[PDB]
Design a protein around this ligand. Structure first.
Ligand SMILES: CNc1nc(Cl)nc2c1ncn2Cc1cc(Cl)ccc1NS(C)(=O)=O
Length: 164
């Protein structure tokens, strides 16, 4: 059911994550990590301290879809093992230096056409698919977006709930 999911999403904060390629989202799903540009890294570290849950909602650029969503389980940590990201043009491996641990809540896709009725107050009420990497999504919009995803029955939210 959706009861444990709703419990995880209670009073959460939501951020849109944009990836230039599928490879990095696949790597994030396999290894349970994400890295983003320094400006967004600061915002996520601030959010992680402030909310019961911080939810990253992933979308690969030009894919027309969201690829799933995950919960931060840590602040960014540097110096550690180097993740073999595929780097876009103008992206250096030092900009993606900070590494967040994440717990996936849903690894299923959602097409943008299915979220056309959801607008984001924190981005001028543009459709929620619209936003730069790191755009915050207001609570009610983010909650309804996450509830539109197909259920991912391979994930037990029981361990997720305990981290809180
Ligand atoms: C592992 N982390 C990432 N991997 C990949 Cl492939 N793309 C990412 C990642 N983080 C953010 N982006 C998107 C991005 C890339 C570049 Cl070079 C310049 C700006 C932006 N932000 S934007 C304009 O909204 O798309």
């Amino acid at each position: 059911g959706t009861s444990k999911l709703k419990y995880v999403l209670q009073d959460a904060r939501f951020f849109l994550i944009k990836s230039n390629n599928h490879e990095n989202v696949s790597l994030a799903k396999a290894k349970g990590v994400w890295s983003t540009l320094p400006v967004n890294e600061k915002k996520l570290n601030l959010a992680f301290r402030s909310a019961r849950s911080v939810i990253l909602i992933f979308s690969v650029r030009e894919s027309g879809k969201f690829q799933g969503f995950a919960r931060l389980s840590s602040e960014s940590h540097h110096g550690g093992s180097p993740i073999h990201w595929v780097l876009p043009a103008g992206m250096s491996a030092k900009m993606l230096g900070g590494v967040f641990k994440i717990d996936w809540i849903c690894r299923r896709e959602l097409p943008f056409t299915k979220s056309a009725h959801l607008t984001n107050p924190w981005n001028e009420h543009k459709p929620v698919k619209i936003g730069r990497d790191g755009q915050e999504i207001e609570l009610e919009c983010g909650t309804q977006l996450c509830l539109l995803f197909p259920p991912d029955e391979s994930i037990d939210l029981y361990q997720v709930i305990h981290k809180m």
